[PDB]
């Protein structure tokens with residue numbers, strides 16, 4: 773019932789912790805790198821239960837699930853993962869920071885989810 777979310781540019785996996793930090797790390801087989809989608813648009817960490825979330829400033833974090841639009845995501849067939857509220861797309865770098873930015877076509881904004 774859970775998937776990994778892997779960056780097409782870096783190969784690192786979307787990951788998060790109990791404090792709500794979101795980051796990418798190389799694959800390690802743990803459950804903090806796994807995510808569920810229960811059908812309401814949310815992307816929930818398999819380990820912590822918290823929902824992937826972001827703001828207009830481009831911060832990405834996890835928070836307890838609150839039913840708001842900032843916790844809803846749209847997965848495109850081309851690999852973009854877009855915040856429903858802000859319209860910004862999930863992005864990450866070689867350092868492992870995660871953020872959102874306007875879509876720009878680069879592979880840092882493309883993800884393989886499965």
Ligand SMILES: OC[C@H]1O[C@H](O[C@@H]2[C@@H](O[C@H]3[C@@H](O)[C@H](O)[C@@H](CO)O[C@@H]3O)O[C@H](CO)[C@@H](O)[C@@H]2O)[C@@H](O)[C@@H](O)[C@@H]1O
Pocket residue numbers: 787788789795797800801802803804805
């Ligand atoms: O440490 C126990 C935990 O290890 C693995 O989980 C990974 C681990 O990451 C460390 C560290 O590698 C990393 O630099 C920072 C994030 O940038 O987080 C931690 O300091 O622990 C975090 C959660 O605390 C995980 O997100 C990460 O995948 C993995 O072996 C896991 O199964 C195990 O419980």
Ligand SMILES: OC[C@H]1O[C@H](O[C@@H]2[C@@H](O[C@H]3[C@@H](O)[C@H](O)[C@@H](CO)O[C@@H]3O)O[C@H](CO)[C@@H](O)[C@@H]2O)[C@@H](O)[C@@H](O)[C@@H]1O
Pocket residue numbers: 825826827828833835838839840841842843
């Ligand atoms: O405040 C109205 C907004 O609330 C809910 O969205 C959440 C909200 O979080 C607060 C605060 O709880 C949070 O700690 C910080 C960031 O950690 O941000 C906010 O000050 O606002 C952020 C965006 O600013 C959302 O990401 C977060 O889920 C939710 O009821 C939402 O629909 C509503 O508009």
Ligand SMILES: OC[C@H]1O[C@H](O[C@@H]2[C@@H](O[C@H]3[C@@H](O)[C@H](O)[C@@H](CO)O[C@@H]3O)O[C@H](CO)[C@@H](O)[C@@H]2O)[C@@H](O)[C@@H](O)[C@@H]1O
Pocket residue numbers: 830863864865866871873876877878879880881
């Ligand atoms: O740097 C060349 C890179 O540009 C485009 O990728 C974006 C770029 O973003 C910067 C910066 O715009 C932003 O302020 C911070 C976060 O707020 O992120 C980056 O520092 O670089 C990163 C990767 O290092 C990308 O994730 C981001 O989308 C894009 O044209 C890309 O193909 C190109 O290599």
